[PDB]
Amino acid sequence: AIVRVHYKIYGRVQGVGFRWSTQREGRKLGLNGWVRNLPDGSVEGVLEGDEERVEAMIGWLHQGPPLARVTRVEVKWEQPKGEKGFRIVG
């Protein structure tokens, strides 16, 4: 079924191609949502789509691109809202 998550990523996650790689992977996996940098140095975003696709993406988010160093992925499960496309915001 379609599900939604709000995620936060900590570590070496800005200046490492994280947003562009997240969008690339999200699209490959057939997900909608968005990703953005936060002032505290973390990355935040939303995934929305088939739960199997979301689960694969959460797996990916624990690594990110080779250059990243992800220390923690925080996940909040939410009701889908009708996200269209996967966008880099900010």
Side-chain angles (χ1 to χ4, degrees):
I2 293 174
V3 301
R4 172 189 178 96
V5 302
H6 179 94
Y7 61 89
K8 305 166 63 62
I9 317 298
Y10 293 108
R12 187 175 67 243
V13 298
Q14 297 193 11
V16 297
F18 212 101
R19 293 176 303 160
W20 285 85
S21 290
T22 294
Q23 177 182 58
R24 180 198 53 69
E25 186 69 12
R27 284 169 172 178
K28 182 190 181 179
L29 298 183
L31 296 169
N32 303 292
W34 51 264
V35 62
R36 69 184 171 195
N37 286 347
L38 294 184
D40 70 356
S42 69
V43 164
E44 163 183 61
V46 158
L47 308 175
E48 199 172 280
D50 301 314
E51 61 194 287
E52 295 74 25
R53 302 173 186 274
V54 174
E55 294 157 358
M57 187 65 178
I58 295 172
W60 182 90
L61 284 167
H62 283 80
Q63 289 73 54
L67 185 55
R69 180 160 174 255
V70 176
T71 57
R72 171 69 179 158
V73 182
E74 293 291 345
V75 177
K76 182 187 295 186
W77 299 84
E78 303 178 335
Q79 294 301 325
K81 314 183 71 176
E83 301 288 339
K84 301 283 192 171
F86 205 110
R87 305 174 309 302
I88 301 176
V89 297

